Each structure stands twice: as structure tokens, then as C-alpha cells.
Design a protein around this ligand. Structure first.
Ligand code: 172
Length: 245
């Protein structure tokens, strides 16, 4: 993340760090995601679609830093990884970018909702906070685009929400965000998401409740005058999310 602050997990008690295991050479960070209910995490197919053998991922909850074992984490396999039956990578733009992972400790069970391990609620149907709401993102994403290492502490930032007519400024993303893709960014240029963040959460405040408003997906550069980060628009997906759940 190219924005504000370094945080710790208990301000993010739903974050999901997902790792690939390798043939021999060990384990590299895939993406974030978010804890749904002790059996489930939510993220984006673009992360896994090239490499779909559920058995190579190792996701974590309660982990606070890329390569250090933080206080009281729990480790996970992924009993099933479910990718959207319809996904597509158009130039820059991603489509129906959503995915589910059923975790399972080495023991067969979903996770124990600790202090450092909460669910976050899904949105309700046709109710997304309005342009100009500040929401927040978490990930271990590049700090600077020019960087080729992801940061070693976790990062969080907050980011204002854009309206589809504004984000379809042809000076922005044209007809390529669409009704199910949600733009947001800090009034231009300075904080934003980036690489290896997608699958992270966009968590807006609705009535009182932190609510999984959107899932990070794409954006042309990180922190660019006229280039919003776009985030999947979660309420358009609550059917699929229950009928593959
Ligand atoms: N603005 C923005 N650029 C991004 C690039 C990514 O690979 C993932 C999220 C992003 N958000």
C-alpha cells in the first residue's frame, strides 16, 4: 500500500494472508482476503486461477508481518478453493474477480474466533455507502511501484469512494469499470493500493458495522492522478456467495 500507516493484526482481525508453497523452493506470498465465518475466506480468482491446486496454499489468520510468526496466529490448509465460473482479465480490468477458500487446520476444523481472529460481515443487498465515504484497506502490498519486495509490516489506509459516472471519466477508466466494480481513492495522487494487495479488504462503515464493502482487484499504477483502484462490489455477489458456500 502506497498510503498511510503501518498497523497490527488486531485492527485487522479478519485479514487473510495466503502463501504458495513451492516445488522445492518454499513459500511466496500470494494475496490477502478476509475471514467470513470460521471456515471461510474471501478473495479474488485472479490470484489463483493460473495455479489452482488447492493443495499448494497456506493461508494465515492472526499473522501480523510477512515473514515472522506473530502472536497466536493459526496456520491453514485450504479444503477447497472455488473460483468464479465466469472470470476474465481485460486490459488492466478484471472480471467477476471473486474467490472462496475453505480453510481447515491440519486437524479438520475452521478457526477459533479469538482476539486476533474475527469475521467481518458481508454487505446487505442494494446498500453500498455513497460516494465520498472513507473506507479502509489492508494488505502487505508494495509501498512504491518501483519496489520489488513487499513491505515487512502490515499496512492500512483509508480511501474515499468514487461514483461510477466520475470514474467513467474517459480521462479515468471509460466504459470499463461497470456497475459491479467499485472505484475509490484519496482525493488525488497520494495513498492507494498496489501490487500483491488484491484479495485485500475494503471495509466501509454501514449504520455502525464494519462491513466487507469490496475486495481489492486492479488499477493502472498505484497512486495516479485519474487512476482509481477498483474493488469488486460485494453486494452484487451475495447469491454466489451463499450458493457456493
Ligand atoms: N490503484 C491500484 N493499483 C492496484 C494494482 C494492483 O495490482 C492491485 C490493486 C491496485 N489498486
Amino acid at each position: 500500500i502506497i498510503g498511510g500507516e503501518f498497523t497490527t493484526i488486531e485492527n485487522q482481525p479478519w485479514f487473510a494472508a495466503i502463501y504458495r508453497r513451492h516445488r522445492g523452493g518454499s513459500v511466496t506470498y500470494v494475496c490477502g482476503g478476509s475471514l467470513m465465518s470460521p471456515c471461510w475466506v474471501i478473495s479474488a480468482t485472479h490470484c489463483f486461477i493460473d495455479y489452482p491446486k488447492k493443495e499448494d496454499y497456506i493461508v494465515y489468520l492472526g499473522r501480523s508481518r510477512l515473514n515472522s510468526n506473530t502472536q497466536g496466529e493459526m496456520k491453514f490448509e485450504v479444503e477447497n478453493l472455488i473460483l468464479h465460473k465466469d472470470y476474465s482479465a481485460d486490459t488492466l480490468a478484471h472480471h467477476n474477480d471473486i474467490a472462496l477458500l475453505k480453510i481447515r487446520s491440519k486437524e479438520g476444523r475452521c478457526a477459533q474466533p479469538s482476539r486476533t481472529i474475527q469475521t467481518i460481515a458481508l454487505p446487505s443487498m442494494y446498500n453500498d455507502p455513497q460516494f465520498g465515504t472513507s473506507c479502509e484497506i489492508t494488505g502487505f502490498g508494495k509501498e512504491n511501484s518501483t519496489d520489488y519486495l513487499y513491505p515487512e509490516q502490515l499496512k492500512m489506509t483509508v480511501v474515499k469512494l468514487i461514483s461510477h459516472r466520475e470514474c467513467q471519466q474517459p480521462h479515468y477508466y471509460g466504459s470499463e469499470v461497470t456497475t459491479k466494480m467499485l472505484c475509490a481513492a484519496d482525493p488525488q495522487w497520494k495513498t492507494d493500493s498496489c501490487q500483491g494487495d488484491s484479495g485485500g479488504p475494503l471495509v466501509c462503515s454501514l449504520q455502525g458495522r464494519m462491513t466487507l464493502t469490496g475486495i481489492v482487484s486492479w488499477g493502472r499504477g498505484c497512486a495516479l492522478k485519474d487512476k482509481p483502484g477498483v474493488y469488486t462490489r460485494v453486494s452484487h455477489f451475495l447469491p454466489w456467495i451463499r450458493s457456493h458456500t
